[PDB]
Amino acid sequence: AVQKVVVHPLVLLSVVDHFNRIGKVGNQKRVVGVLLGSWQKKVLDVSNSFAVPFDEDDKDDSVWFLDHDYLENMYGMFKKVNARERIVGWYHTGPKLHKNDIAINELMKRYCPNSVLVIIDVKPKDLGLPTEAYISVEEVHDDGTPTSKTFEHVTSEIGAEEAEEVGVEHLLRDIKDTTVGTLSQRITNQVHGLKGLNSKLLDIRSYLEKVATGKLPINHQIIYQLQDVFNLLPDVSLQEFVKAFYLKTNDQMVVVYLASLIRSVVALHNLINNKIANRDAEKKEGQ
Amino acid sequence: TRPANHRQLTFEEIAKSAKITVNEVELLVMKALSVGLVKGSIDEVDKRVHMTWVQPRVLDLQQIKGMKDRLEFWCTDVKSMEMLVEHQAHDILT
Amino acid sequence: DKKFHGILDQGEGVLIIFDEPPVDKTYEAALETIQNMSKVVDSLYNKAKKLT
Amino acid sequence: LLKLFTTMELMRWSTLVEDYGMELRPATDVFGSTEEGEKRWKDLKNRVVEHNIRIMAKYYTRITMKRMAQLLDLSVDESEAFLSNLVVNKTIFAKVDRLAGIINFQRPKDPNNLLNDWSQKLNSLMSLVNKTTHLIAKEEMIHNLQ
Amino acid sequence: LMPYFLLTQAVRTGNLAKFNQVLDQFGEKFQADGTYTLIIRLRHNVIKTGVRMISLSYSRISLADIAQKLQLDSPEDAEFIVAKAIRDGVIEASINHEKGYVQSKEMIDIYSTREPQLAFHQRISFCLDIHNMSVKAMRFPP
Amino acid sequence: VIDAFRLINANMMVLGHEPRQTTSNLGHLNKPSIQALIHGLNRHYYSITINYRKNELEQKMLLNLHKKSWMEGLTLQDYSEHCKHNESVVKEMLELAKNYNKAVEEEDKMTQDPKRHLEEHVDVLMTSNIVQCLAAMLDTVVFK
Hints:
This is part of a larger assembly, with chains A, B, C, D, E and F. Chain A is about 50% helix and about 20% strand. Chain A has a seven-stranded mixed barrel. Chain A is built from seven helices and seven strands, in the order βαββαβαβββαααα. By secondary structure, chain A is α/β, with parallel strands linked by helices. Chain B is about 50% helix and about 15% strand. Chain B has three helices and three strands, in the order βααββα. Chain E is mainly alpha-helical. Chain E has a domain at about 105-140. Chain E is built from seven helices and no strands. In chain E, α4 (about 35-55) packs across α6 and α5 (about 65-70) crosses α6 (about 75-90). The longest helix of chain E has 24 residues, at about 115-135. Classes of the chains: A alpha/beta, B alpha+beta, C alpha+beta, D mainly alpha, E mainly alpha, F mainly alpha. Chains in contact: A-B, A-C, A-D, A-E, A-F, B-D, B-F, C-D, C-F, D-F. At the A-F interface, α1, α4, α5 and α7 of A face α3, α4, α5 and α6 of F.
């Protein structure tokens, strides 16, 4: 398997352009293509992508026309243009999976053993990254339950080469934020972090309510992970922690107090200089 | 069953649990630690055991409902403090 | 003479040995900086109270 | 014997001698009792004691000297001498309050270290909840399709 | 201030005779300035200062010892005086009449608590206010 | 550094009519590089202004590159490294304060860089310390 996948801004923009292109030329529920990258240990780096013609029935959910001939032709073309890139996965712009995704992944695994599916949400979210990485693993469930071929989440990240990075910075210079910690921005960052934590807790809570009422089955792995969460919750009422926390707060605040004292002294010196300059100027103007 | 807030367990209450006198709860906890099920420490000076890990196991619907209630409380606290902080710093948020 | 970090007790007859945490250098540097700013304030007096 | 000395559990010397004393009752060393140069039995006893010390230091924070002695199968003073020798050799860390016999393996707790541990717990919690929300998104986002 | 130097010496010594003689000698300045009500409230706080020092340089002193050291008539009188010291908050100490001794507040290492935070908070707010006032008073005549 | 170019016609150049009409104040507003001037920025060809069609969706998806996760936002900087950095900065600030006093005293007696460096150091100290303290409180009363 593969432990991490890092997508590139070029891939992101190609996917967005493909989806917008298909939507402009006609309403559709999804758009599909292939992902070219390179392997360095179990850290896939999706450095490029390209669309492929694709349509499916929304009702039967079992009929679709991915074009393998198109796929192989353009893969060979991109191989000619640039060598060190090989089929590593496929992407689709679907907010939800479908009963076809497994069949299309079966089709792709012929081209790649460790083919990675990537769901790219052209709709801009606000909390997490727009790309989700999945891999199809089928095995005899040690849980003793019937085994069904299904995907598995793969850690995803966004990373760029120096080329794409300079390009994106030049594009974003208008709204790009300071690449340095300014107090107001840090406070806003904490607020945004609280937003994200609240949203994640709400999602987990909704799933737990669904399971408790019974609309869904129970995932032992999910229960295990939430057990680990609740068990990993810290305890902040312990005296041997309260004392240490007070000590560190006092240290930080003594540093802050010294800083403020220096800043006030400098401000007073500046005001003294301004008063002297103003009086000298007025005296000279009068005489 | 014991939450992280007061996760400290005592020799006496373990004895009131599965029938054993309090001279071998130490060995029982030792076997658990060794086989790699629970993690923590044993303070027999005060006759207590501190746990900070438990091998997760499949659970029941009532247990999941209680866990849902706990997460209700946690999420409510998170939202409350988020509102507090944003309201307080409203004049510096970018 | 500070040969080892411990304090006696001639009552129960004990020698409480331990490790003394290193002196926090931050409060040091802060104290000398406070002294420097005090003498800077003296200079600001000498400027203002005599030129105004 | 090898399984016991490779497993992470305390084995009482009394039980081990009432189990595996067959040696020399077979093999060529560690005699149960023999000529002086080959009565290493005492060395084996010391090895059992040292293994017990290691296990206790790994799985305790405050073990009273009485309990430590009655668990190690040595007098209180003998255990004190052995533990002091280990501490001097630097093999084990253990601070002995002999006023109340409160042998403690808890290394002094720096506030830096305590808050770093708390922050690490928080980071692990956040990563775990993020991964769980991803997995649960996939779970519901597949099954509710049915 | 020499008359007040004499008064301070008399109070520190705790000598009522010296207090009375200095009061009689320097009553003139006492109308000149105005302290009589305060100067009898003095005698009050003379005994108060005695008890405050007795509690300052001790941790578990007994009522009998307090009476002996303050020359108070009775241990019950000393008990009343220490209770009034509690009123004034000038000893900040407990007491136990079951055995008859005045225990003191168990002194705590005051750095793992919010007192340093509060002090630094007041000083930081003051420094910020000075900076604000300075940068506002910065003026340009044009 | 990107450029767009198109050629000029020899017949028009010889006729003298300018290679490209100028009906609006646009198109200009750009300083042509001396390199291109030498290589014929006007004798043989002419430059064209380059605009970028930055859609809002593409801008968002680009932002996603360095967008910071809520983990990063709400995490705590290591306390040991934090204390070490605080000490480094405080000692440098002490030295700068000594130099600042020397400068101000000599200025007053006779009648700056130390002040600027002192301001920078005080600002960094204040921001880092306040940020970490606030994050610590947020965490300690959000996670329990």
